[PDB]
Design a protein around this ligand. Structure first.
Ligand code: ADP
Ligand code: ADP
Ligand code: ADP
Lengths: 160, 443, 442, 35, 436
C-alpha cells in the first residue's frame, strides 16, 4: 500500500481547510496567489496541485532571473493560469499582480513589514474587483504567541 | 458529536510522581489502594525485565475491575501491546484450548525492527519477451527472459527478468505506460497506476494517475516495522509471500488454525535473538488481560501452571467476582475466586472495595457530564439514593432514557418528574424478581 | 407475499410526544411497553451511545416479538436489524464466541459515499483485440451523442460486460464508471440488413443529447461483518453467501476498526448503529452470557434487545435457578420492559385486526364466540381458528363466517387442555414415560 | 520531518542484496529458518 | 541466541554434586533436598550410561517443594545434544490427534540418532570477479580471484557458477562460503575495509569439516510417511502416523546401528502434572514403557489420594496401582527457615535487587508464615516501590508497603468469608445494593 494522497491532504488541517476553500475558489473561477515561508512548504504544494491538475507556477529565491520576466509576462497575458506560488520577499517587492485579488498567507507571520510589502504587491492600481486577503492559522499554538508579537509590532509601527 | 459506551471517561490511573493517587482525577473516584497497586504493576511492566508475573483483581460486581485494566492499558500507551480476552474465547472448534492459550500468550510480546528494502520502481517504457528454443519440451517454461525498461526522475534503467519474477509482473496485469514497484526481498510487485504524462480522461476503468517517482530507479530504504511473535509463528506455519508454488497455493486455500510445534517457536526465538543481537530489533514485553477467569476449567489452569514458568511469557492480569465457587471441570473442590490453590499460590491478589453514597453520586455526576446532559441537583440526589437502593449500573443506565424524555418535552434539564417517569417505565432485577415470585404462569 | 403471524404490524403507533394511541398501526393495548419501546427507538435513532441491553419479559402470547417487529418496522431502511433465535449460536464450524461476535458485527452499518461518472450515448464503433487463447483482451470504443464524439480505451471487465448481452454498433447503452454496469437502453439506428440470428428487437429510443459524461455522488451501506469477511482471505465475497467464514483472526478486526476510524476522520464513511434482537435468549450457555458481559462494553456494539418468556428456571450450563433464566451479572446491566396479559376487549380488537388481515369477513356473534374461546383458551388458538372457519364457510358456499362454522371448527380441532384431558383419560392407549403401551383392544 | 512511506508487510526472508548494458535480477528469496 | 528475560527457575544451572554423587549444601543455584538431589544424580548417571531403557521415575511431594526445580536442574546438567521433552498433562487432549498418538509422538521425540558426516567448503575473501557476457547470453566466461589471509588463487568459472554468482550478487570485498556439490553460496558479510563486518578467514581455502547431526525418531517418522512432508514438523499436522512406517524406521535404525553408520542417544521425557492424564493414557504408558526404543520418563505430581480421571475411585497420587508398580518414587520435603532465607537471597541476587538484612529477615518470617512463592513475588514489587522514592536498597517499610498492597491466599479467604454477601456463591446469589 502506497502513501495515500487524500491521507496526505487530510492529516494537515491547514491543508484541509485550504482544500475546502479551493473548491469554491475554482468554482467561481478566480485568480489565486499563495505565499509561503520555506522551500519545503512549496516543495509539497505542487503535489497537491497535481491532484487537481491546476495551472500553477512557482517563483522562489533559487529561480533564475530571466524566468521571473516571462513568468510575470505569462501572468499578465494568459488568464488560464490559476495558482501562483510566491516566496515572502520575492514576489512581494514591487511585482505587478494587478489582476489578482485572493492572496493566501499560509504562514506570513514572521514580521509585519514583509507582510505589508506582500499585500502591497497585489493590492495595486488597475485591479478591477474586490480584494479578499485570507489568513489561515492553527489556533492555540505558537502561532498565537507570534501573532500577538506581530499585532504588537503592527500597532507600534502604525501609531509611530 | 462523539460516542460513549460504558467507559472512555477513564483516561488513566491518575497518580502523582511519587505514586500517591488523588481522590478524584482521571475519571476515577476512590479506590486509592488498588490504583496505587496498579501503578506499581505498570512501573514493573515498564521495567521490562520480569517474565511471567500474575495479579488477580478480586472484588464484587460493579466495583471497577475492568476499569482498572483499561486504565493500565491507557497508562502504558499504544507502544506496548495489550491483549484483552474473555474466559470463553479459549474454547474453539478448530484447535485445542491449550494451543489457543499459547497463541494468546505469544500475541502479547512485541518487537520493533528496522528493515532494509531493495526497490526497483518507475514507469514501464518497454516490455519485450524472448522465446525459448523449444517451448513444448515439457521441462522449462515458454519464455526465457523479458526485457523491461523503467524510467524515473533523473534515471532510466533496463532490466532482464527471471521468468519467476515475470509471473508476478504479469499477475498484476501491467502494461506499457504503467508505474510499478518491485520489492527485491520477496518479488512482490505493486501496480501504482497509469502515468500522468499521457492523456487522462480517455479511460473507462476508474483508474488513478500517479507522477514519476522521485530519485533513481534502484533504491535502498529503511522501514521501521512493529510486529508480534505470533505474527512470525503464523507466517511460518502457513507460508505465503514467496514466488514458488506452495506459497502461491497457500493464498487460495481456506485458512485454518493448527497446532504450531515447539520447534518452530525455538527457531523463531533464535532468529529474533540474532536480530536483536545485531542491534536491529528491540523486544517489548506486554500485558495479557483475561476477564471472567472463572469460566476456565481445570485443564487450562493446569497448563497455565506450566506456561507461567517460561522465560518468554508476559504479565497476565485476571479478574473474578466469585466468593467460594467450585472450579469448573472438577466435582467437589472449592477454592477462592474459582481459581485453584496451586495457581493461587503464584498470583498477587488485589482487593477492590465497594463505594459509598457520595461516591455513587459523583460517579453519576461525571457520567452525566461525559454524556453531555444537564441534571438538576434534586434529580441528582434522587438518582444517588436510587443507586444506593438498587445498583450503581441501574442508576447509570437510566440517565439516557431520562435525557430522551427530557428532550421530548422540549427541555434541556432533567427534573424529578422525568426520573419518576423513567422509574415507572423501566424496571430493575429486584422488582422483576418480585413480579416473578408472585406470578400466574411463569411471567 | 404470504400472510404471516405479524404481517399486520406496520410501526409502533406513537404520537410526536411518544404517547401511544389505543389503536394505531395494527397494535392495540400495551401502553407502557409501547412507550418504552418508543424511548428505545429514539435512543437508537440518536446513535450517540452503544452497548445498552434491553430485556422484554412476560407470559406467553403477550406481544414480545410483536413489539420487536413493530420496532423493526418503525426503524426504517438503512438501519440494520439482526434478529436471531437463541439456538442458532451452537454450530459445528464456528465457536459460540465467534458466532456471537459475527452477530454483534452484523448490526453496525458503514455508509460510504463514492463518486461516479455516468455516460449515455449511441454506440458507433467497437474494436476488440484478443489473444489467440482469449486471455489478454483490450480494445477501443467510439461512442457518440448528438453533440460530441469520444473514443475510450477498454479493460478486461468492460469487454466482458460488452460481450454479455451483445451490443451491435448503433444501440444506446449506459455506462457507470464506479459500478461497471452495462445497461442497454435500446436501439436507435434501425438497420435494415440483419443476420438470421441475434436480432435486437430492442424497443426504439431516441439518441441522447447534451453532455456525454455526468458526475454523481452516490452512497451505499455495507456491514462491518462483510468488511471482515471480504478482507479475511482471497475469496471472501463467495464466503459472504456460502457462510464459510471460519474463525476470523483478531488482527483483521483491529485493522478494520482502525481503517473505519480513518474513514470517519477523512469524511468518506459514517457509522450507523443498529439493533440486535435475540428471541428466546434463555437457550444460551453461561459462557455466552460471560462473553456478552464483556462484548457490551465496546464502542462498536449495537443496542441488544432480548426476549424471555420464562420465569425462575435453571440457567443452561449450570445447576442453579435464576430469574428469567439469566445470571445476575447480565441482569445488573440491563433495563427490563414488562408486558402484561390482555382483557376481553383487547382480545376482541386483536381478533378483528387479524380477521381484517386474512380478508375474512366475520359476523358479530361469531366474533363474540371467538372472544369467549380466546378468554377461556389462549389467544393463538382463536386466531388460528379463523382460516379454518373461513374454509368451512367456503365449503357451504357462503362468504360470511357464521356461528356454526366456528362450532364445527371447535369440534374438529382440539385445544391443549382438551387434548391433555383425552390423553389422561386413555393413558393405556399411548406410550408413557416407561415405554409401556396396550395396543390390543381385547 | 517524517514523510509517510510504503506500508508493506515485514519480509521474513534472506535474499541477495547489494552492499553499495542492463541489470539482471533473479528471484533469490530464501527462508532464514534452515532444516 | 536463546533469548530469555528472567524465569522462575533461571537461577538453577544444574545439580550441585561432587564426583561421588554427594550433594553440596549450596551449589549451582540449588540448596537443600539432599536425598532427592542424590537420587536425581543417580537418575542422571542412568541417562548418561544409556545401557537401560524404559525406566519410570515419579517425583511426588507437597506443592512449591523443588520438583520442577529438580527437573530443570536435571535438564541443565544433561547438557546439549541430548533430547529432553518437557510436556504438561493437559497437552495431549487434542482435536486432530488421539491421546495415544500424541503420547507416542512425545515418546518418540526423546530418542535421537547421531550421524557424523564430512563436507568440503570454500570459505574465502573475494578479490576480483571478471564476467564476460555475450549479446544473447549463450556462453559466459568468468574469472574469480579469491583469497584468505594465507593464500591467493584465481579460478576459471563455468556457466552454472556464473549463474549462481549473478544470483545473490557477490561484489569485491565480500567474504563468502561456496559448496561445490550443491552450489549454495552464502554471503558471510564484508571484510575489514573502511575505504556487516567480519574477519577474513585464515588457512586453506578448501577445507573439509565434520558435522554431527542429531535427528529424532519422530522426524524420520514424519519424513518416511509419504502423505505429508517435513513441514508437518513445523505446522504440526502430522495426523495419525501409521505403525507400518514406525516398524520400518525401527528396523532401519537397528540396521544402521549394526553397520556403525549411526549411534543411539536416549533422552528424558518429563511429564509435569501427571495426575491430569486419563486412565487410557496410563494403560498406554504401561505397555509403551517396555520398548527398546523407550526413553526415561520422569513424572511430577503433587496430589495426594485423589480421584483418578476417567474412573470413580480414589488412588494414591492420582495414579493407578499398576502404573505405580512400574515406578520408583523420589519424595521431597518441606523447607526450613535457613533454606528459605538462602533461596530468597539467591533470588535477590538473580533479579539484581539490593536487600537490607532486616528486610531479608522480614521476608524470611513472612515466607515461613505464608508461602515461599509469595515472598519470592514480593521481592520485585518492593524494588519498584524503592525506586519510586529514589533509593537503591530495599528497606523494611518498602517490604511492608508491598505486604499492605498485595494480598496472599489466607487473607483473601478471610476477607471473602467476612464479606461473602457481596460475592457470587455457588448458587449464584449476590447482593449489589448497599442499603437494606
Ligand atoms: N472509580 C470509578 N470511577 C468511575 N467509574 C467507575 C469506577 N469504578 C467503577 N466504575 C464504573 O462501574 C462500571 C462497572 O465496572 P467494571 O469494572 O466494568 O465491572 P465490574 O466492576 O463488575 O468488574 C463501569 O462501567 C465503570 O465505568
Ligand atoms: N398489541 C398487539 N398487536 C398485535 N398483535 C399482538 C399484540 N399482542 C399480541 N399479539 C399477538 O400475540 C402473539 C404474541 O406472541 P409473541 O409475539 O411471540 O411474543 P410473546 O411470546 O412475548 O408473547 C403474536 O403472535 C401477536 O400476533
Ligand atoms: N532446592 C532449591 N533450590 C533453589 N530454588 C528452589 C529449590 N526448591 C524450590 N525452589 C524454588 O521454589 C519454587 C517452587 O519450585 P517448584 O518445584 O517449581 O514448585 P512445585 O514443587 O509446586 O513444582 C521455584 O520457583 C524454585 O525456584
Amino acid at each position: 500500500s502506497m502513501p495515500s494522497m487524500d491521507r496526505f491532504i487530510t492529516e494537515s488541517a491547514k491543508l484541509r481547510k485550504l482544500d475546502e476553500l479551493l473548491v469554491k475558489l475554482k468554482s467561481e473561477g478566480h485568480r489565486v496567489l499563495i505565499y509561503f515561508q520555506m522551500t519545503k512548504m512549496m516543495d509539497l504544494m505542487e503535489e497537491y496541485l497535481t491532484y487537481r491538475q491546476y495551472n500553477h507556477i512557482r517563483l522562489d529565491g533559487s529561480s533564475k532571473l530571466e524566468d521571473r520576466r516571462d513568468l510575470v509576462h505569462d501572468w499578465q497575458t494568459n488568464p488560464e493560469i490559476f495558482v501562483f506560488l510566491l516566496s515572502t520577499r520575492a514576489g512581494g517587492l514591487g511585482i505587478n499582480l494587478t489582476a489578482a485579488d485572493t492572496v493566501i498567507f499560509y504562514d506570513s507571520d514572521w514580521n509585519p513589514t514583509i507582510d505589508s510589502q506582500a499585500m502591497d504587491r497585489a493590492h495595486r492600481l488597475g485591479q478591477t474587483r474586490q480584494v479578499t486577503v485570507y489568513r489561515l492559522l492553527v489556533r492555540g499554538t505558537i502561532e498565537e504567541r507570534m501573532r500577538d508579537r506581530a499585532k504588537q509590532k503592527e500597532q507600534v509601527q502604525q501609531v509611530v | 458529536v462523539t460516542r460513549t459506551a460504558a467507559h472512555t471517561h477513564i483516561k488513566g490511573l491518575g497518580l502523582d510522581e511519587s505514586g500517591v493517587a488523588k481522590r478524584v482525577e482521571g475519571g476515577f473516584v476512590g479506590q486509592i489502594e488498588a490504583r496505587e497497586a496498579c501503578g506499581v504493576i505498570v512501573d514493573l511492566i515498564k521495567a521490562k525485565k520480569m517474565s511471567g508475573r500474575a495479579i488477580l483483581l478480586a472484588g464484587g460486581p460493579s466495583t471497577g475491575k475492568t476499569a482498572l485494566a483499561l486504565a493500565i492499558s491507557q497508562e502504558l500507551g499504544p507502544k506496548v501491546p495489550f491483549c484483552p480476552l474473555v474466559g470463553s474465547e479459549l474454547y474453539s472448534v478448530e484447535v485445542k484450548k491449550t494451543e489457543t492459550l499459547m497463541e494468546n500468550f505469544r500475541r502479547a510480546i512485541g518487537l520493533r525492527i528496522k528493515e532494509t528494502k531493495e526497490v526497483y520502481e518507475g514507469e514501464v517504457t518497454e516490455l519485450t519477451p524472448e522465446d525459448a528454443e523449444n517451448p513444448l519440451g515439457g521441462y522449462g517454461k515458454t519464455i526465457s527472459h523479458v526485457i523491461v525498461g523503467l524510467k524515473s526522475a533523473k534515471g532510466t534503467k533496463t532490466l532482464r527478468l527471471d521468468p519467476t519474477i515475470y509471473e508476478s509482473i504479469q499477475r498484476e496485469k501491467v502494461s506499457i505506460g504503467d508505474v510499478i514497484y518491485i520489492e527485491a526481498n520477496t518479488g512482490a510487485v505493486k501496480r501504482v497506476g497509469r502515468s500522468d504524462a499521457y492523456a487522462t480522461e480517455f479511460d473507462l476503468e476508474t483508474e488513478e494517475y500517479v507522477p514519476l517517482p522521485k530519485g533513481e530507479v534502484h533504491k535502498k530504504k529503511e522501514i521501521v516495522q512493529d510486529v508480534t511473535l505470533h505474527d512470525l509463528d503464523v507466517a511460518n506455519a502457513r507460508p505465503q509471500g514467496g514466488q514458488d508454488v506452495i506459497s502461491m497455493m497457500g493464498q487460495l486455500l481456506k485458512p485454518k488454525k493448527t497446532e504450531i510445534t515447539e520447534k518452530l517457536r525455538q527457531e523463531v526465538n533464535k532468529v529474533v535473538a540474532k536480530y536483536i543481537d545485531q542491534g536491529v530489533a528491540e523486544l517489548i514485553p506486554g500485558v495479557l488481560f483475561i476477564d471472567e477467569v472463572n469460566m476456565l476449567d481445570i485443564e487450562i489452569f493446569t497448563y497455565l501452571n506450566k506456561a507461567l514458568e517460561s522465560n518468554i511469557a508476559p504479565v497476565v492480569v485476571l479478574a473474578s467476582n466469585r466468593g467460594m465457587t467450585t472450579v469448573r471441570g472438577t466435582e467437589d473442590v472449592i477454592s477462592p475466586h474459582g481459581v485453584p490453590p496451586d495457581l493461587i499460590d503464584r498470583l498477587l491478589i488485589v482487593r477492590t472495595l465497594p463505594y459509598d453514597k457520595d461516591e455513587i453520586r459523583t460517579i453519576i455526576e461525571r457520567r452525566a457530564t461525559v454524556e453531555r446532559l444537564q441534571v438538576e441537583s434534586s434529580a441528582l440526589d434522587l438518582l444517588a439514593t436510587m443507586g444506593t437502593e438498587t445498583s450503581l449500573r441501574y442508576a447509570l443506565q437510566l440517565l439516557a432514557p431520562c435525557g430522551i424524555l427530557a428532550q421530548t418535552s422540549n427541555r434541556k434539564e432533567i427534573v424529578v418528574n422525568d426520573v419518576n417517569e423513567a422509574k415507572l417505565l423501566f424496571l430493575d432485577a429486584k422488582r422483576s424478581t418480585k413480579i416473578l415470585e408472585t406470578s400466574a404462569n411463569y411471567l | 407475499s404470504l400472510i404471516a403471524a405479524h404481517s399486520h404490524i406496520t410501526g409502533l403507533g406513537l404520537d410526536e410526544n411518544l404517547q401511544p394511541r389505543p389503536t394505531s398501526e395494527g397494535m392495540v393495548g400495551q401502553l407502557q411497553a409501547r412507550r418504552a419501546a418508543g424511548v428505545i427507538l429514539k435512543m437508537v435513532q440518536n446513535g450517540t451511545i452503544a452497548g445498552r441491553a434491553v430485556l422484554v419479559a412476560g407470559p406467553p402470547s403477550t406481544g414480545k416479538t410483536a413489539l420487536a417487529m413493530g420496532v423493526s418496522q418503525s426503524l426504517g431502511k438503512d438501519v440494520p436489524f439482526t434478529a436471531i433465535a437463541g439456538s442458532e449460536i451452537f454450530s459445528l464450524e464456528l465457536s459460540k464466541t465467534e458466532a456471537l461476535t459475527q452477530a454483534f458485527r452484523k448490526s453496525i452499518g458503514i455508509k460510504i459515499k463514492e463518486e461516479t461518472e455516468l455516460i449515455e450515448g449511441e454506440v458507433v464503433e467497437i474494436q476488440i483485440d484478443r489473444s489467440i487463447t482469449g486471455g489478454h483482451k483490450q480494445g477501443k470504443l467510439t461512442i457518440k451523442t448528438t453533440d460530441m464524439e469520444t473514443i475510450y480505451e477498454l479493460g478486461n471487465k468492460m469487454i466482458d460486460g460488452l460481450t454479455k448481452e451483445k451490443v451491435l454498433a448503433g444501440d444506446v447503452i449506459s455506462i457507470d464508471k464506479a459500478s461497471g454496469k452495462i445497461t442497454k437502453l435500446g436501439r436507435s439506428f434501425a438497420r435494415s440488413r440483419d443476420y438470421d440470428a441475434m436480432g435486437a428487437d430492442t424497443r426504439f429510443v431516441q439518441c441522447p443529447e447534451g453532455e456525454l459524461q455526468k458526475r454523481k455522488t452516490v452512497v451505499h451501506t455495507v456491514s462491518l461483518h462483510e468488511i471482515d469477511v471480504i478482507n479475511s482471505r482471497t475469496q471472501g465475497f463467495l464466503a459472504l453467501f456460502t457462510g464459510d467464514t471460519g474463525e476470523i483472526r483478531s488482527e483483521v478486526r483491529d485493522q478494520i476498526n482502525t481503517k473505519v476510524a480513518e474513514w470517519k476522520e477523512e469524511g468518506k464513511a459514517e457509522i450507523v448503529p443498529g439493533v440486535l434482537f435475540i428471541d428466546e435468549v434463555h437457550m444460551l450457555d453461561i459462557e455466552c452470557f460471560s462473553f456478552i458481559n464483556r462484548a457490551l462494553e465496546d464502542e462498536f456494539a449495537p443496542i441488544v434487545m432480548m426476549a424471555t418468556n420464562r420465569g425462575v428456571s435453571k440457567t443452561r450450563g449450570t445447576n442453579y435457578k435464576s430469574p428469567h433464566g439469566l445470571p445476575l451479572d447480565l441482569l445488573d446491566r440491563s433495563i427490563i420492559i414488562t408486558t402484561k396479559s390482555y382483557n376481553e376487549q383487547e382480545i376482541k380488537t386483536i381478533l378483528s385486526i387479524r380477521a381484517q388481515e386474512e380478508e375474512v369477513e366475520l359476523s358479530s356473534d361469531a366474533l363474540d364466540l371467538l372472544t369467549k374461546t380466546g378468554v377461556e383458551t389462549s389467544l393463538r388458538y382463536s386466531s388460528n381458528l379463523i382460516s379454518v372457519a373461513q374454509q368451512i364457510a367456503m365449503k357451504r358456499k357462503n362468504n360470511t363466517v357464521e356461528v356454526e362454522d366456528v362450532k364445527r371448527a371447535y369440534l374438529l380441532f382440539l385445544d391443549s387442555a382438551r387434548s391433555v384431558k383425552y390423553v389422561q383419560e386413555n393413558e393405556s392407549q399411548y406410550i408413557d414415560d416407561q415405554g409401556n403401551v396396550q395396543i390390543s383392544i381385547a | 520531518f517524517e514523510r509517510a512511506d510504503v506500508d508493506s508487510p515485514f519480509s521474513f526472508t534472506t535474499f541477495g542484496k547489494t552492499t553499495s548494458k542492463f541489470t539482471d535480477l533473479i528471484y533469490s528469496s530464501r527462508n532464514p529458518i534452515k532444516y
